């Protein structure tokens, strides 16, 4: 988060936090609730968000789900939608900490190497997260939608 990031820099320069790094921490915390709210709004419609994304994903790309595609079968489509749940959970983590280190350390570093051998087409995973993005920002107000949306796009770009 912004707090640990400032600690990191100030420590690399053997110094106390600058007035600028303190203002930011003040402001990042003062907006804490805003963040929590956003996370809860998503977390509480977990299922609604995930299943919709699945529906859309599947229509735009009926491949992955036809015989021969990574998610064909019920077990298999279920593991796919489980993976979309994971990413939706990692998004709330970022929108909560206003930082992308968590999305990174958990679902980004090594993801291409993971899916590549899993035989999963990763362009498609990004697709799903895109639907996730719209299904979720659909339930948010304006500002809150801009915020949640940023973390969705980061994940998207990283998976595509």
């Amino acid at each position: 988060s912004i707090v640990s990031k400032s600690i990191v820099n100030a420590d690399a320069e053997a110094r106390y936090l600058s007035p600028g790094e303190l203002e930011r921490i003040k402001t990042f915390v003062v907006g804490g609730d805003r963040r929590l709210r956003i996370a809860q709004t998503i977390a509480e419609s977990r299922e609604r968000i995930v299943k919709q994304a699945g529906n859309q994903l599947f229509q735009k790309r009926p491949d992955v789900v036809s015989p021969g595609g990574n998610a064909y079968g019920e077990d298999m489509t279920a593991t796919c939608l489980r993976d979309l749940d994971y990413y939706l959970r990692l998004v709330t983590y970022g929108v909560v900490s206003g930082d992308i280190t968590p999305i990174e350390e958990i679902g980004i570093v090594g993801v291409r190497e993971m899916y590549k051998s899993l035989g999963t087409p990763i362009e498609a995973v990004a697709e799903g997260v895109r639907e996730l993005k719209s299904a979720a920002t659909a339930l948010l107000t304006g500002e809150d939608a801009d915020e949640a949306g940023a973390y969705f796009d980061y994940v998207i770009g990283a998976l595509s």
Binding site: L17, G32, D33, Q40
Partner: protein, 161 residues
Amino acid sequence: MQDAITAVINASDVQGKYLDSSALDRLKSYFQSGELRVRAAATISANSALIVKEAVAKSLLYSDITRPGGNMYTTRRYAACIRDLEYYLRYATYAMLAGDTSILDERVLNGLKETYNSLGVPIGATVQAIQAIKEVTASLVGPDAGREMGVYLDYISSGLS
């Protein structure tokens, strides 16, 4: 290194759960005490050189330590001691703003209790001195934040005790 925000994120990630009801509470109350920790992190910075200068007095002065043959003797060692006092003060502040001791565990206490005894630093002294930092700093910020800085400074002493 890690702050409370990540600490909570991780505790829930290890279980594959979304923010837990309890985690939001933990998180939220960390946000509320954010401004106090910043206010305190400011005065400690603005009075760091002073905090140490006073602590050394009520603690490491006019004792056997600074005379020939003790560990503070020579302008080389004396300087080295004050330097270490600044690290604890600054790292305690870092740890206080983060609400997590990981930065002390990773950047301060690691193989420190050894290095000391190796160079024959007088552990019990460095602790009586630290204690002085807690009191001196406490009087400037307040037992409210002094309360929390005490918890962290004591945390470095124990890493030596």
